[PDB]
Design a protein around this ligand. Sequence first.
Ligand SMILES: Oc1cc(O)cc(/C=C/c2ccc(O)cc2O)c1
Ligand SMILES: Oc1cc(O)cc(/C=C\c2ccc(O)cc2O)c1
Ligand SMILES: [Mg+2]
Lengths: 229, 237
Amino acid sequence: CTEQITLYTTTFSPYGHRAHIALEEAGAEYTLCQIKPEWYKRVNPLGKVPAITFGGPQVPPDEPSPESEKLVESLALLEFVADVFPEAKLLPASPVQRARARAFIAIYQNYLHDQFRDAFFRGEPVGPFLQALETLQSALPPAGFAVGEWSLAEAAVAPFLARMMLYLDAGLGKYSEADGETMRAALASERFARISQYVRDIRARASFVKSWGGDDVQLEAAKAIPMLR
Amino acid sequence: CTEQITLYTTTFSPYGHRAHIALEEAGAEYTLCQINVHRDKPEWYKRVNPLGKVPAITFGGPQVPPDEPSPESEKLVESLALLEFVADVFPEAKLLPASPVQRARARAFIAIYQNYLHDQFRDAFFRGEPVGPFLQALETLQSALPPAGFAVGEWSLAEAAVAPFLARMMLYLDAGLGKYSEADGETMRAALASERFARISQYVRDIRARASFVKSWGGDDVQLEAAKAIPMLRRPA
Ligand SMILES: Oc1cc(O)cc(/C=C/c2ccc(O)cc2O)c1
Ligand SMILES: Oc1cc(O)cc(/C=C\c2ccc(O)cc2O)c1
Ligand SMILES: [Mg+2]
């Protein structure tokens, strides 16, 4: 591909971290723009972020061209990179294996994503989070990533599982000291050994390393978030 | 495609209907196995999915009645994944458009359905919550459509994903099914025939005209009957 690619995100957005991982896996040449400025309504009138501009002239990100195609919705941005760079095999080759990668993302979206938010941001009962974590965990093979090799599955879920672990280790979140104790114990137990290794293997992935600030930075960022208290 | 395809669904499931639409759009040779919602699910279904998940596809393996699933078939669940599977198996059907950008916009339209309207359909019709959010989400979805035609001009998986749900909620509305108050029902019915919602009204009848929808829908009267036997849709006395 030769069209210009520009990815827009807020600095520590997990949704934008999705698109950042996939552009890295793809070997793409792209501009990265972290931040809401007045100009941004030219990327998306609604202020939706993350966003990708595609095609048009090379432009500084804060001057998006009227010619470029503008795209939003993080999981569609994943599919987009995969489609633009088929040669990077961001998804596997067979339809069945692609179907399992997508099913795995749906498990995260439909079952775990909201309870992660209940347990860590709304201080709600933690029980359902751990069950949804297990359910996603159960869809992993004994080794490797969700469908064996790295795929959009990982781009989709990595930013969120890595932040969960970072928060739990750091005691950030709105859960009770009691529920926080219960989650630290679950994640360190054999029940959740598979998912814990998954995150470890995720965190070793070069595309994750590059698009993660480092634990230092993510932590400094984290400790300026209200909903984490 | 030479592999056998079998689609398992509880009857009248909008989730299974998604994949039905897509198999009909694809021109696929497929076997359709309907399970009764209100029975328990046959013991044999565990061989298609141990947790009883529907809808589900078996792919390949030997040719077998659906109640005799072969272990040699690959088994897939999750309706939005099943849509992308059919497109992947039948690329000549162009269930998604050709360019990455248009593909991305079709997938984004599915996201808007899921992020906003899907849960207000449940809240307003099955839980009886105030319906203002439901209208606003319908508007949000409506504003993502182009001036005419389908979400990305030509029909795509966007319609496979959203048609089963948009059609049932408009069916339920005109017939007054749901847990919402009777005032909120007149509010919704009035809003839907208003000019505010002309575009989404045009989208729904354009959906209902599509061959693949007609054949997988099997008529309003049988969808009404199916819905009058969903207990969660009944206001209590
Ligand atoms: O058998 C039927 C008939 C029908 O009309 C709708 C449904 C389900 C709708 C639904 C479920 C979960 C959710 O979060 C949101 C939803 O809209 C099932
Ligand atoms: O790779 C793909 C492609 C696609 O079209 C859909 C999905 C999955 C789930 C999904 C999408 C959007 C959303 O807001 C919620 C969802 O559950 C996965
Ligand atoms: Mg609600």
